[PDB]
Amino acid sequence: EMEKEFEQIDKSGSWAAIYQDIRHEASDFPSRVAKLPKNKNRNRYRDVSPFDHSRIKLHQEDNDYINASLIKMEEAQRSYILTQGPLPNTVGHFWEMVWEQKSRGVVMLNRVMEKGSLKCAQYWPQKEEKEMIFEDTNLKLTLISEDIKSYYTVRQLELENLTTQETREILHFHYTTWPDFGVPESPASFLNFLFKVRESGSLSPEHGPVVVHCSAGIGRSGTFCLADTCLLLMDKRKDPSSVDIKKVLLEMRKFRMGLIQTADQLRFSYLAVIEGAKFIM
Numbered sequence: 001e002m003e004k005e006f007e008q009i010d011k012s013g014s015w016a017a018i019y020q021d022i023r024h025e026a027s028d029f030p031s032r033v034a035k036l037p038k039n040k041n042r043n044r045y046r047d048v049s050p051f052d053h054s055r056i057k058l059h060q061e062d063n064d065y066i067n068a069s070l071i072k073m074e075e076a077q078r079s080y081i082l083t084q085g086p087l088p089n090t091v092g093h094f095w096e097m098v099w100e101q102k103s104r105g106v107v108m109l110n111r112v113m114e115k116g117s118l119k120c121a122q123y124w125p126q127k128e129e130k131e132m133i134f135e136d137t138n139l140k141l142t143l144i145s146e147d148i149k150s151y152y153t154v155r156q157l158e159l160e161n162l163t164t165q166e167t168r169e170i171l172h173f174h175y176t177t178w179p180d181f182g183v184p185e186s187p188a189s190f191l192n193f194l195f196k197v198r199e200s201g202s203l204s205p206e207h208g209p210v211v212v213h214c215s216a217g218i219g220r221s222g223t224f225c226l227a228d229t230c231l232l233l234m235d236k237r238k239d240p241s242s243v244d245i246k247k248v249l250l251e252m253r254k255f256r257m258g259l260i261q262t263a264d265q266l267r268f269s270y271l272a273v274i275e276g277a278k279f280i281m
């Protein structure tokens, strides 16, 4: 059981050691499309690339490339798109992907500015009456409503395909209180946030995969997907303590490199799964 394994690693202070074994066992697949010179202004970080095998392709004949991966968790029957925070020149591509993959939700785990630098473009409207038009991808985005709570904001957005005049409702789940350094002290507000996303239907198989991002799309984003999938597997399995976080994380790392960036994020993931298991047992 992971709770005892938690106490063992914590009492022995072995988190950096566990984390290094995960780093050493992690998959390494080609990312040739990411590294083409024509794609250098589509990547926020030169050392964070989708693998070719799991990369989301835009349906635009010119350049299909976006820094985004499909993470397919076969046993849990859950998919996620993990992506980087959009850049100024990729906001249109972002919303094109949302449209094309039939996503119902967008999960944002960063603030636009952290540590005095921009981590993400402002890619949604701040006021109802000032909609955004992405001329490159022929999409219109309108803010419908915004519910601001202590730890997170939920926004209803209308995405319109200007080409077909079809419209869809997108839910934007913005976790606003992840600290600039380290991880939250308690996983309570993060679990509350994850349960809210689940309750919305955004993670349900009726819809395309949820889009999840932070700045790079691997750290905080990783923690979100890892906790969700681990909790879902505990519901599904005859024996809930058969769930090994380290194995699930390595399975997720076949689809996108670097998921969970620090030993602190790994400890936090264990704590979130352990605490969330109480509200699921």
Ligand SMILES: O=C1CN2C[C@H](N1)c1ccccc1S2(=O)=O
Pocket (backbone or CB within 6 Å): 040, 041, 042, 043, 044, 045, 087, 089
């Ligand atoms: O802050 C930026 C702005 N861009 C995204 C990324 N960094 C980058 C990296 C290498 C070359 C060009 C660019 S960018 O498109 O100007």
